[PDB]
RNA sequence: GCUUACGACCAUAUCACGUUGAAUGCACGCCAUCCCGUCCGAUCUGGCAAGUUAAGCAACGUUGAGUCCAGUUAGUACUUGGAUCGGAGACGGCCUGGGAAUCCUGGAUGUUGUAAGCU
RNA sequence: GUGAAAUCGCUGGAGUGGAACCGGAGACAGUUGAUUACGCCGACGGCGUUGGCUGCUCGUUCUAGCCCGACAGUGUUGCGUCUUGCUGGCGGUAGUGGGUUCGUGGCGGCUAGCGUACGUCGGUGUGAAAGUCGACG
RNA sequence: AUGAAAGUAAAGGUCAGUCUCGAAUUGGCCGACGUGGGAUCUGUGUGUGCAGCGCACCACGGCCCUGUGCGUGU
RNA sequence: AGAGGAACCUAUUCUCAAACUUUCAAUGGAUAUGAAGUUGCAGUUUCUUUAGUGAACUGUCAACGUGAAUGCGAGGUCCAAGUGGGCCAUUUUUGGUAAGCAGAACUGGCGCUGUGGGAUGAACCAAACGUGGAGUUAAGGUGCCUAACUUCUCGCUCAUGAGACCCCAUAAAAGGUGUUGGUUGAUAUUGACAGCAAUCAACUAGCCCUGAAAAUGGAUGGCGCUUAAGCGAGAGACCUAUACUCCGCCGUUGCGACAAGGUCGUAACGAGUAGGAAGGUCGUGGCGGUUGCGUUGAAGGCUGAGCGU
């Protein structure tokens, strides 16, 4: 409710309401396990993303 | 194969900087070194005695020794699969502080002090921790005397 | 690459501007007309043409507001102006093109199939540099000029119906004219 | 698929003694009933060192039960060693040890129990000390054998005090090029 | 038939296989490879302190 | 506002031409018995104080050259990762992130430490 | 003494279009089992689990059109700063009122595999034997 | 154990003295060295903390035997 | 290559450098980010200083209390196999006219490896594998071969064998008044060109055409396809892996319960050449013992009902 009140105040005199930038994301893996660079290889793993239609949440930073 | 002399390939790395040519200043020797500091290794082409090898140009290295007019630094050098703690004895002018230990020395400091304080003055504990630059918070930006500009894709100009 | 993927495409109106530092504490805000299959598609070409005109990227920038734009009056027809830059396999190009359609959103997409159908041009080779409503009067294509006729007319020639849901086989004699 | 390594999945350990000794299978059945039951890290201890093999139990020397004893507090503590207890010839003086061991020879036991001592098994420990009460737990050195000699850096690398495999000893038998410097070098 | 054929292709692969292993950390504490008039006094310290 | 001795950073301090320079000082300066060194008291060395700011040195001046800083060049050149991307190929753009350097334009022209002294 | 395999002849059955053999899945032939409750099988319901397809209904976001007012234009009917149409932005929204978006939303319909909070029932089998049923094949 | 060999061959820690203040000497106590980490054990608070004794083992040192270079004397 | 004062001087100018450079990225490399720490107090030194002046060390000294993100148990020793012909690919790169040629860098693969797709193929795209089932998909596809639409929208293309999908299985310089779009400059209702109401010219780029010749008969995989079953932009649905989710069973690994060299529970997992280990109430022949069967038929041989992966 406040997210849109404030929004459409804004709005009324012109201005712009600009809301909070995303604190957490959801990620999923995609791509299969084989042909992997090193390094993507191991910031799967760090993220525990270690197989296909494997989710986490992640807190973006 | 290539040739395995102790300067080969070196031949911009030993030179000196374009108008640094000459005399070496003295901070080089006023400059305190003492064992446990970390140090910089930067060759200094103009002294060819106490040179570190090629390998170790440019690499971080801590103290163990002070001698007259050298200090012995242990470096780490990869070797296959393992890290080498390897110790060489370089003189002062191809060292300089490392200035990464004196910031963290620092904040330490200031932590200790900022804990002190306000134990003393009793304060709550307060955050000591470096934290990762979060997202953006919400603000609001207003278009007085700062009206939009419409922006449209340029054509293609024939610039002979 | 970008691809004018949907049926239709939407149009977006986004608002942006380069982030305040210390020595700019108050930056110009920009503001772009973009046709796009969804928003997220609407911020990143946002920010390519932008980057193209200013000195900004993505990084030290960021989207005041971005809004899809509904066309007001579906229910009249107009003729579309689209002034167009593009790639082709030798040169760069500048086309002015003319579409009929209740939207403009509607004319774009209209464009955006004419440029693949006629050029082989994908959409990741070409700029909408504008798009407006021309009068009848204005306009200079002959497809589009030959419908702005109050009496006209025309028949279907040769009508070939396709059956839908009965068998392949049929008895029945077909028919391609209808009077 | 997933991105796993399963190189490290099997850790190789005893569950049960290697010896076909039947009081020894005993002693280790005990001891895991105890060790499950009465969940104690020092029956744990025990257990495990009852199933390790006879080259990581080294004997044990009366002089260094009579040093453990002799500490301000381990007077009346019951000493606990898996390793076989031998004479010692130069210690003069045993004082009084109460101790629970596998085996002790001969020698030890007679000065043992001459010096007012007493000597246990492992199942009389298990009913003095369920939980390993009062106890005094103790091995021999597992490093000192003569294989372990042999064992390090090569013996012709740097700064290497590793004892070399020789036929025999004595000026003929490695000793002459690359051992001093008036042969080639010295390492 | 030539039979020199040098490459490094397979080299990082089997250097990481095991893990890069990084130096211990007691290797600071060692006082090797020190001045020897240096250890000649820190002995001679060491020697005369009273502990009580 | 200055002078000297010893410096630190080592041109924002250099270079060219010119103006001015209170007081201390620096300097030029006079002499060559002695110490000392030379073909040569030119340099170096020693003993001095008649004379001079002429030069050195300092401050200042110049739409000055150089040096330094910034803007622009330019989100350009280049580049990490992606595509059953376009193209006969050479190559090219798009997606995802990093991101320069000349020309040209504008500005600045030493800062500062210890000791002693002038004002 | 025993008397294997390869190779070979006869009798009966069956296949047989430029190879033959072989794995998976059925069918046929054939072989084999079969004590009210219980076995061996099927069907229909219920429940659990994983679903697949498919409707209504509220709301949320961003937005209109219809309708009203003036202005500008014109693919314009009827008889010219005419009229009727039509379009464009702009200003209104009372009423009416659809698109778009999705909800820690609400109510449904059809139906699958697997298992058995479990029910209602059928085929068969209690000497032979025949038949029938079941499983292999 | 060590040296090619003649051969030689593994007890110090601490406290106090005398002193010709040294590359001296004496006497007690203890006796297989010191420190850090150490499963376990012990005590004591509240799964956890603190304290003590510390096995094996590791790290850093100290002494002792032998060969050898330097270097003294009593 | 000129210019201003034949060479010379001055200020310029066109084009350049693997073994030239003022300047200088992106990728890249290294180190640090606390208890093995920070503050003091109170001792040792034969080192160092004019000097408690420093440097270092020591103490059962005192206090403080874990100082970026994410993930995760860590470390040590011993014994030993096979290997020491490699090859391929994106990118960079040397020799060579080039090469399915020779030589290098990073990474990923094949070798050692099956599976869906590319008609076929060691390496390409998707995805890695116990044994079964249901559902959903990746890459690829849906006229018939062939499971899935002669499905929906807009264009372009007629070729006297058009074209038809990464690697990939060749095509260029140069042309066309074939057709379709665009750019620029003109003329035209004070009536444009042709003949006694739009037109002219030059360009440009899509498809098509010419350039385009090889030997057994032959290849978008084949048949065939022409408002396509071709070319380009798109939309619904649909088909299909040993992949993903869920369900059963076997085993391995980790952990756990139980008075057991055993049973059970639970979660995750299962590719494999050379090679290494483990289990084998798998099999064979002796010996010391033990358990039994046998002329009412042992060994051996031929072959139905079962058991075990």
Same mark, same amino acid.
């Given at each position: 409710?406040?997210?849109?009140?404030?929004?459409?105040?804004?709005?009324?005199?012109?201005?712009?309401?600009?809301?909070?930038?995303?604190?957490?994301?959801?990620?999923?893996?995609?791509?299969?396990?084989?042909?992997?660079?090193?390094?993507?290889?191991?910031?799967?793993?760090?993220?525990?993303?270690?197989?296909?239609?494997?989710?986490?949440?992640?807190?973006?930073? | 194969?290539?040739?395995?002399?102790?300067?080969?390939?070196?031949?911009?790395?030993?030179?000196?900087?374009?108008?640094?040519?000459?005399?070496?200043?003295?901070?080089?020797?006023?400059?305190?070194?003492?064992?446990?500091?970390?140090?910089?290794? #930067?060759?200094?082409?103009?002294?060819?005695?106490?040179?570190? @090898?090629?390998?170790?140009?440019?690499?971080?290295?801590?103290?163990?020794?002070?001698?007259?007019?050298?200090?012995?630094?242990?470096?780490?050098?990869?070797?296959?699969?393992?890290?080498?703690?390897?110790?060489?004895?370089?003189?002062?002018?191809?060292?300089?502080?490392? #200035?990464?230990?004196?910031? @963290?020395?620092?904040?330490?400091?200031?932590?200790?002090? #900022?804990?002190?304080?306000?134990?003393?003055?009793?304060?709550?504990?307060?955050?000591?921790?470096?934290?990762?630059?979060?997202?953006?918070?919400?603000?609001?930006?207003?278009?007085?005397?700062?009206?939009?500009?419409?922006?449209?894709?340029?054509?293609?100009?024939?610039?002979? | 690459?970008?691809?004018?993927?949907? +049926?239709?495409?939407?149009?977006?109106?986004?608002?942006?501007?380069?982030?305040?530092? +210390?020595? +700019?504490?108050?930056?110009?805000?920009?503001?772009?007309?973009? %046709?796009?299959?969804?928003?997220?598609?609407?911020?990143?070409?946002?920010? &390519? %043409?932008?980057?193209?005109?200013?000195?900004?990227?993505?990084?030290?920038?960021?989207?005041?507001?971005?809004?899809?734009?509904? +066309?007001?009056?579906?229910?009249?027809?107009?003729?579309?102006?689209?002034?167009?830059?593009?790639?082709?396999?030798?040169?760069?190009?500048?086309? &002015?093109?003319? &579409?009929?359609?209740?939207?403009?959103?509607?004319?774009?997409?209209?464009?955006?199939?004419?440029?693949?159908?006629?050029?082989?041009?994908?959409?990741?080779?070409?700029?909408?540099?504008?798009?407006?409503?021309?009068?009848?009067?204005?306009?200079?294509?002959?497809?589009?000029?030959? %419908?702005?006729?109050?009496?006209?007319?025309?028949?279907?020639?040769?009508?070939?119906?396709?059956?839908?849901?009965?068998?392949? %086989?049929?008895?029945?004699?077909?028919?391609?004219?209808?009077? | 698929?997933?991105?796993?390594?399963?190189?490290?999945?099997?850790? =190789?350990?005893?569950?049960?003694?290697?010896?076909?000794?039947?009081?020894?299978?005993?002693?280790?059945?005990?001891?895991?009933?105890?060790?499950?039951?009465?969940?104690?890290?020092?029956? =744990?201890?025990?257990?495990?060192?009852?199933?390790?093999?006879?080259?990581?139990?080294?004997?044990?020397?009366?002089?260094?039960?009579?040093?453990?004893?002799?500490?301000?507090?381990?007077?009346?503590?019951?000493?606990?060693?898996?390793?076989?207890?031998?004479?010692?010839?130069?210690?003069?003086?045993?004082?009084?040890?109460?101790?629970?061991?596998?085996?002790?020879?001969?020698?030890?036991?007679?000065?043992?129990?001459?010096?007012?001592?007493?000597?246990?098994?492992?199942?009389?420990? =298990?009913?003095?000390?369920?939980?390993?009460?009062?106890?005094?737990?103790?091995?021999?050195?597992?490093?000192?054998?003569?294989?372990?000699?042999?064992?390090?850096? =090569?013996?012709?690398?740097?700064?290497?005090?590793?004892?070399?495999?020789?036929?025999?000893?004595?000026?003929?038998?490695?000793?002459?090029?690359?051992?001093?410097?008036?042969?080639?070098?010295?390492? | 038939?030539?039979?020199?054929?040098?490459?490094?292709?397979?080299?990082?692969?089997?250097?990481?296989?095991?893990?890069?292993?990084?130096?211990?950390?007691?290797?600071?504490?060692?006082?090797?490879?020190?001045?020897?008039?240096?250890?000649?006094?820190?002995?001679?310290?060491?020697?005369?302190?009273?502990?009580?």
């Amino acid at each position: 409710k406040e997210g849109l009140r404030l929004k459409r105040e804004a709005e009324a005199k012109g201005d712009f309401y600009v809301p909070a930038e995303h604190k957490v994301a959801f990620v999923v893996r995609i791509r299969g396990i084989n042909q992997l660079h090193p390094k993507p290889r191991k910031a799967l793993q760090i993220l525990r993303l270690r197989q296909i239609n494997n989710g986490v949440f992640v807190k973006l930073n | 194969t290539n040739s395995k002399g102790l300067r080969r390939g070196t031949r911009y790395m030993f030179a000196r900087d374009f108008r640094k040519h000459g005399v070496e200043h003295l901070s080089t020797y006023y400059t305190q070194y003492k064992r446990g500091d970390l140090v910089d290794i #930067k060759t200094n082409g103009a002294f060819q005695k106490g040179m570190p @090898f090629k390998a170790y140009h440019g690499r971080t290295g801590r103290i163990f020794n002070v001698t007259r007019g050298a200090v012995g630094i242990i470096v780490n050098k990869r070797v296959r699969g393992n890290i080498l703690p390897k110790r060489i004895n370089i003189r002062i002018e191809h060292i300089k502080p490392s #200035k990464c230990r004196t910031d @963290f020395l620092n904040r330490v400091k200031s932590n200790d002090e #900022k804990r002190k304080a306000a134990k003393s003055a009793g304060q709550p504990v307060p955050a000591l921790k470096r934290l990762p630059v979060a997202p953006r918070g919400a603000h609001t930006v207003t278009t007085q005397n700062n009206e939009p500009e419409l922006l449209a894709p340029l054509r293609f100009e024939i610039v002979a | 690459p970008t691809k004018a993927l949907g +049926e239709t495409l939407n149009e977006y109106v986004v608002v942006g501007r380069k982030i305040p530092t +210390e020595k +700019e504490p108050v930056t110009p805000i920009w503001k772009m007309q973009i %046709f796009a299959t969804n928003h997220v598609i609407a911020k990143s070409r946002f920010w &390519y %043409f932008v980057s193209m005109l200013r000195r900004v990227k993505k990084a030290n920038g960021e989207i005041l507001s971005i809004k899809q734009v509904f +066309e007001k009056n579906p229910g009249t027809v107009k003729n579309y102006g689209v002034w167009l830059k593009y790639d082709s396999r030798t040169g760069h190009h500048n086309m &002015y093109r003319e &579409y009929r359609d209740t939207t403009v959103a509607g004319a774009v997409t209209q464009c955006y199939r004419d440029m693949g159908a006629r050029h082989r041009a994908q959409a990741d080779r070409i700029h909408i540099l504008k798009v407006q409503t021309v009068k009848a009067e204005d306009t200079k294509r002959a497809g589009i000029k030959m %419908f702005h006729d109050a009496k006209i007319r025309f028949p279907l020639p040769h009508r070939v119906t396709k059956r839908k849901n009965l068998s392949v %086989f049929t008895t029945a004699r077909q028919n391609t004219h209808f009077a | 698929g997933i991105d796993i390594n399963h190189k490290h999945d099997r850790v =190789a350990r005893r569950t049960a003694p290697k010896s076909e000794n039947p009081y020894l299978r005993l002693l280790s059945k005990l001891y895991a009933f105890l060790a499950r039951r009465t969940g104690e890290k020092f029956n =744990a201890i025990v257990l495990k060192r009852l199933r390790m093999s006879r080259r990581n139990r080294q004997p044990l020397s009366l002089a260094k039960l009579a040093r453990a004893v002799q500490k301000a507090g381990n007077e009346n503590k019951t000493v606990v060693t898996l390793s076989t207890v031998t004479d010692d010839a130069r210690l003069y003086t045993v004082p009084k040890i109460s101790v629970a061991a596998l085996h002790v020879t001969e020698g030890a036991r007679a000065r043992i129990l001459a010096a007012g001592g007493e000597i246990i098994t492992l199942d009389q420990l =298990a009913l003095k000390s369920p939980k390993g009460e009062n106890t005094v737990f103790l091995q021999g050195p597992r490093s000192a054998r003569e294989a372990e000699k042999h064992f390090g850096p =090569a013996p012709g690398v740097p700064h290497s005090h590793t004892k070399p495999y020789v036929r025999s000893k004595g000026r003929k038998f490695e000793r002459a090029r690359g051992r001093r410097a008036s042969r080639a070098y010295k390492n | 038939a030539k039979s020199k054929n040098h490459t490094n292709h397979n080299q990082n692969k089997k250097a990481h296989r095991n893990g890069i292993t990084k130096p211990k950390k007691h290797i600071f504490l060692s006082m090797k490879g020190v001045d020897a008039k240096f250890i000649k006094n820190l002995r001679f310290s060491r020697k005369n302190n009273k502990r009580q």
